[PDB]
């Protein structure tokens, strides 16, 4: 129920989601 | 042009299909999205069940204060037994959700469906030309949940006493088995961690001598420098002995596991070394042995809080 | 101050520099 | 040399049979002389419980542990 | 602060001694313990039924020195609870409402810098074999 | 005569069959 | 003045679907002791 | 091409320039290997030391040596 | 002879000696190898065999004892050595042999002469891999074991209170230890072991399927039945269709291999990846660094008297193991403990 | 090109943008340690140091900063409970600004050598080529090293011209920042003994100048030079690993 | 709130296991 | 605070990794 936890997730959950779209975008233009 | 059946037939035989739908198939998709969709419900919201038959529920639901770890679908009450209980022989719903039917459920139409789908396993190996034993090798795990789900009920006489589907499930799961059985001093459990640890370690050094000598399919090399590391020339020079060999060995190993789990559903534990070495005198010395025997004792007494009314546990 | 372990611990030394001593004589006759 | 060759020479068979008995006759000397007992300190089936303890021996410190062993022991 | 130190003694007027926890056991039972070595008296678990209870054998607590210095309890429920505060050291008194503590202890920052390292070490020693093995078989791994 | 395979063969079955022996022996202590 | 070494990352539609998963599996087994 | 030219480069040039020069045969390798012998010896009397394994008077090995 | 053509030295004779092909590859490594692991199975045999754990334990552990196979073992020194390296010449045992061996010492010796094997056993991988030119894959394989015997072995005694709480060398011996952390430390419950156990599963489950496709997706290469005859390892043809398998695992299971490279590399990585993630979870606990309990279905439990869940069943069951267990486990202890405060199911 | 896994590797065969990605490294890690020294100096409670010390609320910069000297802030309270009579430069917030302030030049430093990466000085005379003498760095790295670590014992340890370290009792009641002198003897050789640091600070320092000078000098051997792969960039990461 | 969050996590991951399934790059020269 | 942190995090994220998305697509081919 902390805010701590809930935020270290989205976190977790969402910039590698980010970072990994980054590079497959970049690769399928190519 | 052809019946209606022909066409049928034709498409559910086909080979062009994303997955393939086959005989077996007919059966083994209804089963195993029922089972899915039960244990999804089942899993996210349900009333605590009644497992140890003494009016005392647990609950294992997400929506009943639980998370991913500890959640489960509780098995069937003990009053229950070994009846079948289906929703149609319930008076509500609800008598249904407290008396633990949907564990029922989830179990017959999940070992249907993995008995399917070894038969689509085969099915398919056989309509593209290949060798059918891929289900052979399958049929070890299906045997190991068979005997998980089906055989230890049966022999132990309820399904209360059957692997709860939860992660903590399962460890308890554990601890009791080897409290009332002592698993670990079993030979056939020993053979299965064996092929268990032999997998692995098959599986690492045969990924690394092949990628190894995967210079810009396996060259001679690496049958040299397995000789020179071991000391076992010749032993593995044929590819198709090697592979064999790493498909016998960790299906041998999870087969008697399965045998000596199903042979303990029949109260026949493993090996007892407990007050065997002796003194001169008559006094009992101590041994490894022993410190387990405790372990399984202190395992024993917290094995159920209010269930037993007997001073020897018969069940 | 020389202490009983502390002789210990050289005669510790002195016998594994014997043992690696004899191991290079060993690996030098044989090489030639 | 092959080891078909080393199996076939009567050498190795002769030289073996008055050595692979006297080792087995020196193991079981070795057991039964008690020998064994003495050179590695395992109690003899009768001395587990002295009369002074009675119990389990429980090693306390180990600066001193040389003495204590062998009070122990009964030695 | 300090609630002083506690010391147990029977209706006998024997000197009793809580036996201390040790770091394994995250619960510990508590037992009270003579000079000798025999336990005297014990918390009967949870629901048993004991004869060496801490009301059967009227053990009374007294603390000296700290915040309660000089005062002796007798009621057997504020002596069990002493008891089983006292089985984990020195009696302390604590406000759990500032930070809304859990209860549970936790780790200091000695615990955590160790741990940390320790396993830092042990990935960097895998570091180490990768890249040596990468720097000795150079000619095989680019060509 | 004395070579690496000789020592090494040696080195493995000498003190096996004293164990062998020595276990053989044990056997037959009475408890 | 240009850099000669230029190179460019690659990561395949596989590559995507691995590392999601990934991710999405190590969220779900540590969520639980996260939030405690 | 020739690269970019600093007073810092240049004044710094010579400590770099001297590469891939060796020493013919096995150079200091003895002397090398009498210093890591050294070393190990040195690290073992430190952790015999600091394990108690090797008790010496004047240390104390404990925190009374605070004390002194 | 070199790069410049230079002169010859011993060094130059003991490297041609040691790198001779034979029977038993010695090479470089070996001189750490053949005598520390020799001395290791040495060890443990003849403890096994003759020393006893009396005096460090207060069991009987030996052939000569009585012990079987299964419930013989080199049992660690007393916890009143801690963490003593316990060597022979050591102030502990001041030179003498049966003390030693009275003393626990063995168990010292086994396990550092076997750890330093495990060095050298790598470094021969190594010199192998160097010999045939190949790259040294097999020896980032093994880097995994190593990591799970200096964690388990090494690294958690020392962040106990001594080599006392080490595993003993023996089955017995080592299902102690396994039920002792299922007690004390939860280690089910620890997500580091569950990865650990993922990969060891995972690693199985590739290796029975990798094997099975392989041997049902053979060429006709030959006549007759026996298809291993059919077999020669100078051939330069693939033995087994790739296509017929990947079209045959992408339509039974949904997703299925393309590349051989690809695949046998997950087959190296994913048991490494298991048994290192296992070797930091040991590291957490060599802490006391627990996973133990979740405070909030705790918390719940304490106030509400009807909330039951596998997980507090579990947690009694770890009390259980403790308290029973506890009393012969650490004798050093001297715990007595009441029977009237043993933890017990009241149904009796 | 590359995977996800080798990015990095585009570094390896030019010495610039080596440093300008080292540069960039340690203007993060001093940038983390300024954060931290805020964030924990803005979360501290000095109230009560006898019953809620720093080891008791989570501190884990804290400790490291006041064992080698700091005690004062600029709050008006140093560590000790007592009142500051004069904080100075050397405070917890002004040494967390001054590694704030080195994360940032090292951060432009970066950037500067990332921009301008061709110099003239990474390129050997001989064949004009990006060439680095890796032994005669590392003697020069370890006769800078050997200096900082004798001027570190001698001059702030002992007290001469720093503060010195911290010293305690053994029962850890009253410990503050002393002064040590360094013990020569056996005694120096006890992790408990804080002379020992000082000596063998001094004597490291020492034995590392010389070994600076003797690796800056002397050329290595061909035998060495070929079995180490000392001409090889990788080996050095192998061995500082 | 965390029994959403659960299930958010058990839903994308089911998810992706069905992307991944059927919208796969096909696989050319095996 | 829960409300608004997470708010400003997803804003500050989910926005940036679609232009980042978008860049990195446009800058593959030069
Ligand atoms: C020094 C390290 C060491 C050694 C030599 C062994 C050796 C052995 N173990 Mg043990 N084990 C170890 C560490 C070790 N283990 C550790 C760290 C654990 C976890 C705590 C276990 C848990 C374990 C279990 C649970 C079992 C074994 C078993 C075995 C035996 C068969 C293993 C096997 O098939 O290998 C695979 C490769 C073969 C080539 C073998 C005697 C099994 C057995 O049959 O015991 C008699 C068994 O049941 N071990
Ligand atoms: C001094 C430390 C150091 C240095 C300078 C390098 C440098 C290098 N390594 Mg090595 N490595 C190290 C330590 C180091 N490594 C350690 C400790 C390990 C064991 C874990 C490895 C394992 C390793 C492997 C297995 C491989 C390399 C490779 C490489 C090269 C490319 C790395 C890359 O592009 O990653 C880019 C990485 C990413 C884009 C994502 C990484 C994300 C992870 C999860 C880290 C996340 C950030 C992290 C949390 C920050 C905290 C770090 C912590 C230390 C505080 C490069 C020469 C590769 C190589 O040479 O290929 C030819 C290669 O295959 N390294
Ligand atoms: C699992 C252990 C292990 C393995 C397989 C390797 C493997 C390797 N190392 Mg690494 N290394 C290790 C541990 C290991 N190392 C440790 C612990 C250190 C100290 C921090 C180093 C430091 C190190 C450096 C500095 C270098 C290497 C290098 C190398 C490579 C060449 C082989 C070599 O130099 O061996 C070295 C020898 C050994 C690892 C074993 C020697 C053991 C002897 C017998 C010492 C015994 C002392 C004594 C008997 C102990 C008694 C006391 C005890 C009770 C405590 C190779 C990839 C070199 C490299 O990659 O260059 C390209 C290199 O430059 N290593
Ligand atoms: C290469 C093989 C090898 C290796 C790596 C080891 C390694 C080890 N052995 Mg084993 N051992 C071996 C061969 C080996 N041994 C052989 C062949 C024998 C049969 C004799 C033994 C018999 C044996 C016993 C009986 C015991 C060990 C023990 C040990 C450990 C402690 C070693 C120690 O303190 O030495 C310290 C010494 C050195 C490391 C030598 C370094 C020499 C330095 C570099 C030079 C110093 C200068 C020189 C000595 C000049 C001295 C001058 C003087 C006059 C002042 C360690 C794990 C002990 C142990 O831990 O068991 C619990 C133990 O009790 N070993
Ligand atoms: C001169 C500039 C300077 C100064 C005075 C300080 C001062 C300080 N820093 Mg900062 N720091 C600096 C630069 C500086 N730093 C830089 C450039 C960085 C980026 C890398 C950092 C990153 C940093 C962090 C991340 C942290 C500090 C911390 C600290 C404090 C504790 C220092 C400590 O315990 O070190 C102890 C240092 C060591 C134990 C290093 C040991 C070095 C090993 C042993 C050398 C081994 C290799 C050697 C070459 C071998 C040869 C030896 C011999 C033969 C020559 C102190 C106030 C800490 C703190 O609490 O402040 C917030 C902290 O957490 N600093
Ligand atoms: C219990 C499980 C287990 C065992 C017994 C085992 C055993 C072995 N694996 C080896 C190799 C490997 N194992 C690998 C991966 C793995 N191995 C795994 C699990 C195991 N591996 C797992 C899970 C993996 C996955 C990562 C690889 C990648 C390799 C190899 O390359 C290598 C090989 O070639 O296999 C044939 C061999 C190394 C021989 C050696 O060190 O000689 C030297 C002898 C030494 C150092 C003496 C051992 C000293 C030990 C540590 C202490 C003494 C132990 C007692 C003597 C016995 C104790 C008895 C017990 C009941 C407690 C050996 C046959
Ligand atoms: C409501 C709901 C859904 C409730 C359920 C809740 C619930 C309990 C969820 C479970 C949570 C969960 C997922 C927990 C697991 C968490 C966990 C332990 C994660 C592990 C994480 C991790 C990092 C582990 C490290 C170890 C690791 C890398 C393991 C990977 C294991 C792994 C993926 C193994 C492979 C398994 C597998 C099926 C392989 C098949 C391969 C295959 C198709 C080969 C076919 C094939 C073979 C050939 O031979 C050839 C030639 C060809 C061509 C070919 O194709
Ligand atoms: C992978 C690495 C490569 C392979 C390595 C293979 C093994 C190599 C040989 C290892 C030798 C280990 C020597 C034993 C050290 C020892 O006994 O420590 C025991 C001693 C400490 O000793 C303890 O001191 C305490 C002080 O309050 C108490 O008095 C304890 O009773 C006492 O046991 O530590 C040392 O001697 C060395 C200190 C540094 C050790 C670093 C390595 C271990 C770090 C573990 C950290 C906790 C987790
Ligand atoms: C009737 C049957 C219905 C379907 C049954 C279920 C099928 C599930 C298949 C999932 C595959 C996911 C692969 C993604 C990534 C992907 O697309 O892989 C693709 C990969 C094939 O890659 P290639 O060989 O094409 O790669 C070529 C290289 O050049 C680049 O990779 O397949 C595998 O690696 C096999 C291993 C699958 C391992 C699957 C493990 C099980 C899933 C994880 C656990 C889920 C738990 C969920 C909890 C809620
Ligand atoms: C995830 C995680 C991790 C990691 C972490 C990290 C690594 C972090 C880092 C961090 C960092 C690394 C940070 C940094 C920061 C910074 C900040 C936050 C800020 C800043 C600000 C400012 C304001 C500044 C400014 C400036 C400068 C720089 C100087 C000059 C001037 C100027 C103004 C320009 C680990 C694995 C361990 C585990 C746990 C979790
Ligand atoms: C320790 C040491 C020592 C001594 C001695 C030694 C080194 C010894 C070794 C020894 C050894 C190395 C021994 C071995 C042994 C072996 C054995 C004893 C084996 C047995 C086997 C068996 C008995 C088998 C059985 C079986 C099988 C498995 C198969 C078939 C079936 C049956 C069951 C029959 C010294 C102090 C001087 C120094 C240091 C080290
Ligand atoms: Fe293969």
Not at chain 10, 198 to 218: K, N, W
Request: proline share 5%.
């Amino acid at each position: 129920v902390n805010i701590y936890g809930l935020t270290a997730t989205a976190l977790f959950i969402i910039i590698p989601t980010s970072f990994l779209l980054i590079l497959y975008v970049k690769t399928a233009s190519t | 042009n052809s019946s209606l059946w022909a066409r049928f037939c034709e498409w559910i035989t086909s080979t062009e299909n994303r997955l393939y739908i086959g005989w077996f198939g007919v059966i083994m998709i209804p089963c195993l999205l029922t089972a899915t969709s039960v244990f999804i419900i089942a899993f996210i919201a349900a009333p605590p069940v009644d497992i140890d038959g003494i009016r005392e529920p647990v609950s294992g639901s997400l929506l009943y204060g639980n998370n991913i770890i500890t959640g489960a679908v509780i098995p069937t009450s003990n009053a229950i037994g070994l009846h079948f209980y289906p929703i149609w022989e319930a008076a509500s719903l609800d008598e249904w959700l407290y008396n633990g039917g949907p564990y029922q459920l989830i179990v017959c139409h999940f070992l249907l469906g993995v008995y399917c789908y070894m038969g689509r396993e085969w099915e398919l190996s056989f309509r593209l030309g290949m060798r059918p034993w891929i289900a052979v090798a399958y049929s070890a795990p299906v045997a190991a949940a068979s005997a998980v789900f089906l055989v230890y009920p049966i022999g132990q006489g309820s399904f209360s006493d059957g692997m709860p589907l939860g992660i903590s499930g399962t460890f308890n799961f554990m601890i009791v088995f080897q409290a009332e059985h002592n698993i670990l001093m079993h030979p056939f459990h020993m053979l299965g961690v064996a092929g268990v640890f032999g997998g692995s370690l098959f599986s690492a050094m045969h990924g690394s001598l092949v990628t190894s000598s995967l210079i810009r399919y396996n060259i001679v090399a690496a049958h040299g420098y397995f000789g020179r590391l071991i000391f076992q020339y010749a032993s593995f020079n044929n590819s198709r002995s090697l592979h064999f060999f790493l498909a016998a060995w960790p299906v041998i190993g999870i087969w008697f596991t399965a045998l000596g789990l199903s042979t303990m559903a029949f109260n026949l534990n493993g090996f007892n070394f407990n007050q065997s070495v002796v003194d001169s005198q008559g006094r009992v010395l101590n041994t490894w042995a022993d410190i387990i025997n405790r372990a399984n004792l202190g395992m024993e007494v917290m094995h159920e809080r209010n269930a037993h009314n007997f001073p020897l546990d018969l069940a | 101050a020389v202490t009983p372990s502390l002789k210990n611990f050289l005669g510790s030394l002195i016998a594994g520099a014997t043992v690696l001593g004899g191991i290079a004589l060993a690996i030098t006759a044989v090489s030639k | 040399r092959p080891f078909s060759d080393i199996l076939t020479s009567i050498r190795y068979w002769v030289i073996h049979s008055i050595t692979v008995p006297a080792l087995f006759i020196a193991g079981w000397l070795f057991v039964s002389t008690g020998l064994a007992y003495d050179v590695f300190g395992t109690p003899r089936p009768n001395e587990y419980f002295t009369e002074d303890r009675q119990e389990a021996p429980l090693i306390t410190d180990r600066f001193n542990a040389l003495e204590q062993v062998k009070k122990l022991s009964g030695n | 602060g300090w609630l002083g130190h506690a010391s147990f003694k029977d209706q006998e007027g024997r000197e009793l001694f809580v036996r201390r926890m040790p770091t394994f056991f995250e619960t510990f039972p508590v037992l009270l313990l003579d000079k000798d070595g025999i336990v005297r008296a014990d918390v009967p678990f949870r629901k048993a039924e004991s004869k060496y209870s801490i009301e059967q054998v009227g053990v009374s607590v007294t603390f000296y020195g700290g915040e309660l210095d000089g005062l002796t309890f007798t009621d057997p429920a504020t002596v069990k609870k002493y008891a089983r505060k006292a089985q984990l050291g020195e009696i302390f008194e604590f406000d759990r409402s500032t930070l809304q503590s859990d209860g549970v202890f936790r780790s200091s920052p000695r615990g955590w810098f160790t741990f940390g390292h320790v396993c830092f070490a042990l990935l960097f020693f895998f570091g180490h074999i990768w890249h040596g093995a990468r720097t000795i078989f150079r000619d095989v791994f680019a060509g | 005569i004395f070579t690496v395979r000789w020592l090494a063969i040696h080195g493995i079955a000498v003190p096996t069959i004293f164990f062998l022996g020595a276990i053989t022996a044990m056997q037959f202590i009475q408890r | 003045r240009p850099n000669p070494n230029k190179q460019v990352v690659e990561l395949n539609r596989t590559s995507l679907y691995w590392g999601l998963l990934l991710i999405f599996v190590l969220a779900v087994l540590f969520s639980s002791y996260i939030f405690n | 091409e020739p690269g970019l030219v600093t007073p810092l480069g240049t004044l710094l040039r010579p400590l770099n320039s001297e590469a891939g020069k060796v020493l013919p045969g096995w150079g200091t390798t003895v002397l090398m290997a009498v210093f890591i012998l050294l070393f190990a010896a040195f690290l073992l009397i430190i952790l015999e030391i600091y394990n108690s394994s090797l008790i010496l008077d004047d240390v104390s090995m404990s925190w009374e040596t605070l004390a002194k | 002879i070199g790069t410049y053509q230079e002169k010859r030295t011993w060094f130059d004779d003991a490297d041609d000696w040691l790198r001779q092909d034979r029977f038993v590859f010695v090479g470089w490594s070996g001189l750490l190898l053949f005598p520390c692991a020799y001395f290791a199975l040495g060890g443990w045999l003849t403890g096994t065999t003759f020393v006893t754990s009396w005096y460090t334990h207060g069991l009987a552990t030996s052939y000569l004892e009585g012990c079987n196979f299964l419930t013989a073992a080199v049992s660690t020194p007393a916890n009143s050595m801690a963490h003593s390296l316990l060597f022979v010449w050591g102030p502990e045992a001041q030179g003498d042999f049966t003390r030693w061996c009275q003393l626990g010492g063995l168990w010292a010796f086994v396990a550092l002469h076997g750890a330093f094997g495990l060095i050298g056993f790598m470094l021969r991988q190594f010199e192998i891999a160097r010999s045939v030119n190949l790259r040294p894959y097999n020896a980032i394989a093994f880097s995994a074991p190593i990591a799970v015997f200096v964690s388990v072995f090494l690294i958690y005694p020392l962040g106990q209170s001594g080599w006392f709480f080490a595993p003993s060398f023996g089955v017995a011996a080592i299902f102690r230890f396994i039920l002792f952390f299922q007690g004390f430390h939860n280690w089910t419950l620890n997500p580091f072991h569950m990865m650990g156990v993922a990969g060891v599963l995972g690693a199985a489950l590739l290796c029975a399927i990798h094997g099975a496709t392989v041997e049902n997706t053979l060429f006709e290469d030959g006549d007759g039945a026996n298809t291993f005859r059919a077999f020669n390892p100078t051939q330069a043809e693939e033995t087994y269709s790739m296509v017929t398998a990947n079209r045959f695992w992408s339509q039974i299971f949904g997703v299925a291999f393309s590349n051989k490279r690809w695949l046998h590399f997950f087959m190296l990585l994913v048991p490494v990846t298991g048994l290192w993630m296992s070797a930091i979870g040991v590291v957490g606990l060599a802490l006391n660094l627990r996973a133990y309990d979740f405070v909030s279905q705790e918390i719940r439990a304490a106030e509400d008297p009807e909330f039951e869940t596998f997980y507090t069943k579990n947690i009694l069951l770890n009390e259980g193991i403790r308290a029973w267990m506890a009393a012969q486990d650490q004798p050093h202890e001297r715990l007595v403990f009441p029977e009237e405060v043993l933890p017990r199911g009241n149904a009796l | 090109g590359l995977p996800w896994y080798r990015v990095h590797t585009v570094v390896i065969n030019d010495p610039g943008r080596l440093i300008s990605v080292h540069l960039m490294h340690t203007a993060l890690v001093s940038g983390w340690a300024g954060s931290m020294a805020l964030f924990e100096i803005s979360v501290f409670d000095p109230s009560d140091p006898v019953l809620n010390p720093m080891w008791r609320q989570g501190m884990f910069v804290l400790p490291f900063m006041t064992r080698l000297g700091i005690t004062q802030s600029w709050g008006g309270w140093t560590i000790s409970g007592e009142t500051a009579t004069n904080p100075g430069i050397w405070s917890y917030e002004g040494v967390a600004a001054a590694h704030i302030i080195l994360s940032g030049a090292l951060f432009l430093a970066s950037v500067w050598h990332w921009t301008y990466w061709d110099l003239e000085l990474f390129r050997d005379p001989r064949t004009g080529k990006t060439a680095l003498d890796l032994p005669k760095i590392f003697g020069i790295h370890l006769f800078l090293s050997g200096l900082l670590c004798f001027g570190f014992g001698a001059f702030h340890v002992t007290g001469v011209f720093g503060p010195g370290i911290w010293v305690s009792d053994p029962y850890g009641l009253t410990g503050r920042v002393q002064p040590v002198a360094p013990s020569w003897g056996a005694d120096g050789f006890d992790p408990y003994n804080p002379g020992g640091i000082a000596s063998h600070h001094i004597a490291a320092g020492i034995l590392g100048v010389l070994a600076g000078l003797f690796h800056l000098c002397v050329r290595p051997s061909i035998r060495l030079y070929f079995g180490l792969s000392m001409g090889s960039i990788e080996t050095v990461l192998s061995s500082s690993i | 709130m965390e029994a959403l969050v659960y299930t958010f996590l058990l839903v994308g991951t089911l998810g992706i296991i069905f992307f991944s399934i059927f919208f796969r790059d096909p696989p050319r020269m095996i």
